[PDB]
PDB file of C-alpha atoms in Angstrom:
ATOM      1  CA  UNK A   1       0.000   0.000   0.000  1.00 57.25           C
ATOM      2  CA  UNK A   2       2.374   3.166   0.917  1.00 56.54           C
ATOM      3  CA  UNK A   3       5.827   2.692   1.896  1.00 55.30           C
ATOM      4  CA  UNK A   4       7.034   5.853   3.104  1.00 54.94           C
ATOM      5  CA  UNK A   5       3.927   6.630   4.870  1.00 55.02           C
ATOM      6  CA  UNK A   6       3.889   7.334   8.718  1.00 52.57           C
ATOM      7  CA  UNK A   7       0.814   7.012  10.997  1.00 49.29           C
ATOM      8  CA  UNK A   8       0.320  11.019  12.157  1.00 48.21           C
ATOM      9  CA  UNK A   9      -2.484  12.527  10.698  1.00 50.82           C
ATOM     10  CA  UNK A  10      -1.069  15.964   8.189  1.00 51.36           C
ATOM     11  CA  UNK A  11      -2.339  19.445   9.183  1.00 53.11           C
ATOM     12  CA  UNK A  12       1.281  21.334   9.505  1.00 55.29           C
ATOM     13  CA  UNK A  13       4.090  20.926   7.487  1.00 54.10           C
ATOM     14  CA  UNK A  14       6.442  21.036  10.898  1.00 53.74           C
ATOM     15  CA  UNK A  15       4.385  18.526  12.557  1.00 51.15           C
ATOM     16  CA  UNK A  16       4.983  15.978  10.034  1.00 50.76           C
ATOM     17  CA  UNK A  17       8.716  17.586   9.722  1.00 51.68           C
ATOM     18  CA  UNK A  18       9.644  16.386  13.064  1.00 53.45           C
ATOM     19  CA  UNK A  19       8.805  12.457  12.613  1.00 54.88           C
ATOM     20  CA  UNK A  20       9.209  12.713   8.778  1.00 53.47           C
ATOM     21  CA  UNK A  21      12.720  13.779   9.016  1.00 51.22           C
ATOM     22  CA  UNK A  22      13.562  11.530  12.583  1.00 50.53           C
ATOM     23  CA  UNK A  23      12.007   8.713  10.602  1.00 47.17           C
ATOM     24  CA  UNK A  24      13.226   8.883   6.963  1.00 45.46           C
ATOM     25  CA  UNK A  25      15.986  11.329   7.613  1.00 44.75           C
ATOM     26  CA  UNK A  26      14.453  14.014   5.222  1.00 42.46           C
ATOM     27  CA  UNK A  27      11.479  16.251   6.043  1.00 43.92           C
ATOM     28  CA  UNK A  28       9.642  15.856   2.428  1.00 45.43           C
ATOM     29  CA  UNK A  29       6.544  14.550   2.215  1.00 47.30           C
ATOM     30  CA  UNK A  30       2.756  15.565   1.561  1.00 46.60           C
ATOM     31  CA  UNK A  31      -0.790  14.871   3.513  1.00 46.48           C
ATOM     32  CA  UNK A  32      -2.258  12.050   1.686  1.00 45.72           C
ATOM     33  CA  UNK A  33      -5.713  10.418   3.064  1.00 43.44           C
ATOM     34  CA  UNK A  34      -5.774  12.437   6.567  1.00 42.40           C
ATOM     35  CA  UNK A  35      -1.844  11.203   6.765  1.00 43.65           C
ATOM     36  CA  UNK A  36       1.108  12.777   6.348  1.00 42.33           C
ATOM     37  CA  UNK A  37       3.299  10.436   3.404  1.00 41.59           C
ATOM     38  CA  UNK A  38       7.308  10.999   2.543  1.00 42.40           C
ATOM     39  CA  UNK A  39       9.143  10.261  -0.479  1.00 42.24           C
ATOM     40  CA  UNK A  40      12.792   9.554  -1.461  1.00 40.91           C
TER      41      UNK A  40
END
């Protein structure tokens, strides 16, 4: 299904920064189905 896809709801580009980047290593990713998703 998603890959890089965490399971914190989107809503603020730093709020999804924080795990997004800790997680992956780079904050980049978008809010896809109430869910903030990275990509690499």
């Amino acid at each position: 299904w998603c890959s890089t896809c965490l399971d914190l709801a989107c809503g603020a580009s730093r709020e999804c920064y924080d795990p997004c980047f800790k997680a992956f290593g780079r904050a980049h990713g978008k809010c896809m189905n109430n869910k903030c998703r990275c990509y690499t």
